[PDB]
């Protein structure tokens, strides 16, 4: 679910997108909520860090 105003919520629980209770292994409909994009000096305006 979405966030309420100014709430923080640290959690490494792998997100079951469906009804598959993976409970420790990433898979189809079981992903991590934390994702990371990288920043390179050769990237475009919209993809550079601010």
């Amino acid at each position: 679910s979405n966030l309420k105003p100014f709430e923080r919520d640290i959690s490494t629980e792998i997100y079951q997108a469906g009804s598959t209770p993976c409970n420790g292994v990433e898979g189809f409909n079981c992903y991590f909520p934390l994702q990371s994009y990288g920043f390179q000096p050769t990237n475009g305006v919209g993809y550079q860090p601010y």
Partner: protein, 91 residues
């Protein structure tokens, strides 16, 4: 309350009010000993994001029976990330 999410812990142990926000491991039976000889409210501190400690004061600490003299009322609510504590002390 098992170290998978962040958990706010507030303790007033008769002297200094201590507030911490840690990913705490709590015991099966949390307690502080009563002269005090234990501290078992939590078992770990990890990826903690907030701590505050007040000034000292003095309150009751010993086992003493009788009739109650101080009514100490509180309200605890969380609105948009702000944890609001209200209180009133009365004889």
């Amino acid at each position: 309350l098992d170290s998978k999410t962040q958990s706010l812990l507030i303790v007033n142990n008769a002297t200094n009010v201590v507030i911490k926000v840690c990913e705490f491991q709590f015991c099966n039976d949390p307690f502080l000993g009563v002269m005090e000889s234990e501290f078992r409210v939590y078992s770990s501190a990890n990826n903690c994001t907030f701590e505050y400690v007040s000034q000292p004061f003095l309150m009751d600490l010993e086992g003493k029976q009788g009739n109650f003299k101080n009514l100490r009322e509180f309200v605890f609510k969380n609105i948009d990330g702000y944890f609001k504590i209200y209180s009133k002390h009365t004889p």
